[PDB]
Design a protein around this ligand. Structure first.
Ligand SMILES: CN1C(=O)c2ccc(F)cc2O[C@@H]2CNC[C@@H]21
Length: 339
């Protein structure tokens, strides 16, 4: 389609201009009031903050430089910030500011008050197929966009998909996203979502994002992921096996799409064939989807999160509240020069 071709060509033009000249140092910590911790990790946290001069709310991701170094995440953190500052798409969380200080790296993103898709999925139990399809269509378009920029996302899972005021998805956490021309090799991602070629230590490509979409669609429609076990090694054995069982309530069209996304052989997997994303867009399970209307956000969403205003945190859960310390001395300055 000429409209899609011209759209993706312009998208790549605009991405590359920002890719080649990244923004840096666009605010500082004392411009914000800290409100609440929205989420934690082994080297970082995400906190709701309010910008003192404008009153606007943001989600500030704070990465401890020393912990980033210890956990071997330097390149990944530079990838995350350089990619986020360069992309622009209706279903990607926007990076509004970034900066660093003696101790931390900061990525200040738009705050999405509806919370994580994970919470809503677990609260409702499972999404109906139209509801799952509305979210899956947004992911398909977002991956069409990212892959056309030579980016692989590598962290698709319900926790990373936030629901905005209009019920649409905002994808967050680019910590594993990477620009790749061909294959890449890092072991990263959440076990339940990993494609076989990641588990098997093979060079892999964008096909791992399409596998992860199969897992996500299965999880949204069933309420639980297709491969689960107590130990990651047991999950991995299930993933590599080439078998899966579908609930009887799945439509025949859904099962067919999922067999083609959860294809163990990456050279046969939908999204990675000659027709690329069009094998997915043209699949019968998406027959009711108006791709343009989704992109333009003109479809009424199946679900609107309940919240009181732009600073409401009720859709996020409670975490222990810890200090944001900034050392009197600069840590790891050389390692993070490019940030
Ligand atoms: C990693 N991540 C974010 O960066 C993020 C971004 C914006 C936001 F409004 C909240 C938010 O927090 C959650 C917690 N888990 C997924 C999220």
């Amino acid at each position: 389609q000429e409209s899609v071709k011209e759209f993706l060509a312009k998208a790549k033009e605009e991405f590359l201009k920002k890719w080649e000249s990244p923004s840096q140092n666009t605010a500082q910590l004392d411009h914000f009031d800290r409100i609440k911790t929205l989420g934690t990790g082994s080297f970082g946290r995400v906190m709701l903050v309010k910008h003192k001069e404008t009153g606007n709310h943001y989600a500030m991701k704070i990465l401890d430089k020393q912990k980033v170094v210890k956990l071997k995440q330097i390149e990944h953190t530079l990838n995350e910030k350089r990619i986020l500052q360069a992309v622009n798409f209706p279903f990607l969380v926007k990076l509004e500011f970034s900066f660093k200080d003696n101790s931390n790296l900061y990525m200040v993103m738009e705050y999405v008050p509806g919370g994580e898709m994970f919470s809503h999925l677990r609260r409702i139990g499972r999404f109906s197929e139209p509801h799952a399809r509305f979210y899956a269509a947004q992911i398909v378009l977002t991956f069409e966009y990212l892959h056309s920029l030579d980016l692989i996302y590598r962290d698709l899972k319900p926790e990373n998909l936030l629901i905005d005021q209009q019920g649409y998805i905002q994808v967050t956490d680019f910590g594993f996203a990477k620009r790749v021309k061909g294959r890449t090799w890092t072991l990263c991602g959440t076990p339940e979502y990993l494609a076989p070629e990641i588990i098997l230590s093979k060079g892999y490509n964008k096909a791992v994002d399409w596998w992860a979409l199969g897992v996500l669609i299965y999880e949204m429609a069933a309420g639980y992921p297709p491969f689960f076990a107590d130990q990651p090694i047991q999950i991995y054995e299930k993933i590599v096996s080439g078998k899966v069982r579908f609930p009887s309530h799945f439509s025949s069209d859904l099962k067919d799409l999922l067999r083609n996304l959860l294809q163990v052989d990456l050279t046969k997997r939908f999204g990675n064939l000659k027709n690329g994303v069009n094998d997915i867009k043209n699949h019968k399970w998406f027959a009711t989807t108006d791709w343009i209307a989704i992109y333009q956000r003109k479809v009424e969403a199946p679900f609107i999160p309940k919240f009181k205003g732009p600073g409401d945190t009720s859709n996020f859960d409670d975490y222990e509240e810890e200090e944001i310390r900034v050392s009197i001395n600069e840590k790891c300055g050389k390692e993070f020069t490019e940030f």
